[PDB]
Amino acid sequence: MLNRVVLVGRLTKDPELRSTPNGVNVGTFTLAVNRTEREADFINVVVFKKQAENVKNYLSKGSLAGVDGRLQTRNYENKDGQRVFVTEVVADSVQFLEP
Amino acid sequence: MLNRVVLVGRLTKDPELRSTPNGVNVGTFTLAVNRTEREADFINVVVFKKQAENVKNYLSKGSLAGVDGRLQTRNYENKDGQRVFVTEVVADSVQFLEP
Amino acid sequence: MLNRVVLVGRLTKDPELRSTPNGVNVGTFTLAVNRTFTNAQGEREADFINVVVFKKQAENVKNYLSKGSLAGVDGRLQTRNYENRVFVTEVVADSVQFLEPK
Amino acid sequence: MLNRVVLVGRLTKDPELRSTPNGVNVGTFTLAVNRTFTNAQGEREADFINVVVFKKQAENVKNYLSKGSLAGVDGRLQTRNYENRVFVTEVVADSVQFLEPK
Ligand SMILES: O=c1[nH]cc(F)c(=O)[nH]1
Numbered sequence: 450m451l452n453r454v455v456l457v458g459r460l461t462k463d464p465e466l467r468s469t470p471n472g473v474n475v476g477t478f479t480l481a482v483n484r485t486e487r488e489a490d491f492i493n494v495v496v497f498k499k500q501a502e503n504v505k506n507y508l509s510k511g512s513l514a515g516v517d518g519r520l521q522t523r524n525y526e527n528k529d530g531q532r533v534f535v536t537e538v539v540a541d542s543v544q545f546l547e548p
Numbered sequence: 549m550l551n552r553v554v555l556v557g558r559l560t561k562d563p564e565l566r567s568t569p570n571g572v573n574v575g576t577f578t579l580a581v582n583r584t585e586r587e588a589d590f591i592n593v594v595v596f597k598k599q600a601e602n603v604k605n606y607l608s609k610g611s612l613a614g615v616d617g618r619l620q621t622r623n624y625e626n627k628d629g630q631r632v633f634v635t636e637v638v639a640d641s642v643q644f645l646e647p
Numbered sequence: 648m649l650n651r652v653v654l655v656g657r658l659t660k661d662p663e664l665r666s667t668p669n670g671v672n673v674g675t676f677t678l679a680v681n682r683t684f685t686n687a688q689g690e691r692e693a694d695f696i697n698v699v700v701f702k703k704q705a706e707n708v709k710n711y712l713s714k715g716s717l718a719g720v721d722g723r724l725q726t727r728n729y730e731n732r733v734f735v736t737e738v739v740a741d742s743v744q745f746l747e748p749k
Numbered sequence: 750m751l752n753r754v755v756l757v758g759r760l761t762k763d764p765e766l767r768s769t770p771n772g773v774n775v776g777t778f779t780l781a782v783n784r785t786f787t788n789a790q791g792e793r794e795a796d797f798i799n800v801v802v803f804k805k806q807a808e809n810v811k812n813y814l815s816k817g818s819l820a821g822v823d824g825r826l827q828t829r830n831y832e833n834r835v836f837v838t839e840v841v842a843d844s845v846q847f848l849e850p851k
């Protein structure tokens with residue numbers, strides 16, 4: 450079913466790459482998108498494979514970047530017995546616009 | 549900054565309209581979007597004003613509906629001393645497709 | 648660079664299948680996507696976007712979609728021109744949602 | 750019905766402002782939006798979408814945007830035709846992000 454998200458925002462931290470038990474890389478950053486008295490929303494992005502590593506190369510805290518992807522929800526149990534409901538954006542592609 | 553979300557999914561419950569302290573209506577439903585071994589993500593939608601009331605009229609649990617909007621994050625403290633981080637989709641428009 | 652298009656419309660004619668010399672299928676319909684917002688005259692307008700799908704999907708749109716089918720489209724917007732130079736724009740679909748069983 | 754377009758490109762020429770008889774401004778540029786994905790020949794392609802903005806925004810795009818400016822666009826896709834009947838498609842922008850200070 451149609452599920453589409455396009456974003457331009459700035460990374461809050463540096464991208465965090467980590468290596469999965471299957472052996473494939475998984476990227477993590479947060480995009481801060483000023484809303485178009487100014488507030489910004491903070492979407493969490495997830496990238497995989499080739500795209501994931503590129504973001505570790507070129508993107509860093511404060512980089513302006515564009516994102517095209519699908520919007521996903523997962524749930525897990527955190528370090529204690531609590532159920533975290535997460536919503537995030539898995540990026541089909543990630544465009545480096547300006548630092 | 550660019551922030552755009554388009555979705556087609558099915559309502560999980562019936563839409564919940566409620567009336568705000570300012571006097572304006574605020575709509576609430578959850579959209580279940582099968583991903584294009586089938587899983588679905590559950591995005592929470594928010595509508596306001598005219599659009600909000602329409603969804604109470606015409607949409608109900610299981611209605612297939614399309615959504616165009618922006619992606620927003622808010623935080624609050626829940627009934628106990630816990631900080632809920634929420635991400636949701638405020639709908640610029642809501643299209644009734646099929647029940 | 649970012650380039651994305653989401654659309655819900657009804658097909659004006661029936662879908663047209665063709666094959667490239669390369670061996671890959673190419674589906675064709677044009678969508679009638681009513682505007683959600685009324686215009687200054689208070690009347691309701693429609694745009695007619697031309698969609699293109701490729702490979703396996705093109706066969707599915709040929710199988711299940713027909714004139715008047717309600718359908719969703721996710722894709723990018725592409726511009727080409729060729730000789731009698733005609734300026735064409737249409738929507739190459741990454742995916743196509745059939746919003747009707749028929 | 751859903752109809753949405755997001756784009757990031759560079760302007761090919763400088764923005765063109767005009768005014769309607771109604772008194773409302775209408776901005777014009779065309780964007781060059783490089784494809785993110787390479788083609789079968791391994792070369793990089795670009796689409797040239799024509800954008801339209803209205804009212805106050807049109808003046809801002811005229812003020813700050815110029816040929817080669819990197820810019821973001823959020824809007825819908827509209828189809829019109831008129832007499833010498835020319836088939837035009839372009840992107841009426843709900844909003845326009847200036848991705849460069851210049
Ligand atoms: O400012 C932030 N808010 C929320 C986050 F998840 C984050 O990384 N940074």
Ligand SMILES: O=c1[nH]cc(F)c(=O)[nH]1
Nearest residue numbers: 560561577578590591592
């Ligand atoms: O199945 C559901 N998951 C999450 C929700 F918030 C909801 O309302 N329904």
Ligand SMILES: O=c1[nH]cc(F)c(=O)[nH]1
Nearest residue numbers: 659660677678679695836
């Ligand atoms: O109703 C229509 N108007 C214009 C077209 F090109 C078409 O296919 N159908």
Ligand SMILES: O=c1[nH]cc(F)c(=O)[nH]1
Nearest residue numbers: 734761762779780781797
């Ligand atoms: O490089 C260009 N190609 C085609 C066009 F219409 C244009 O404006 N610029």
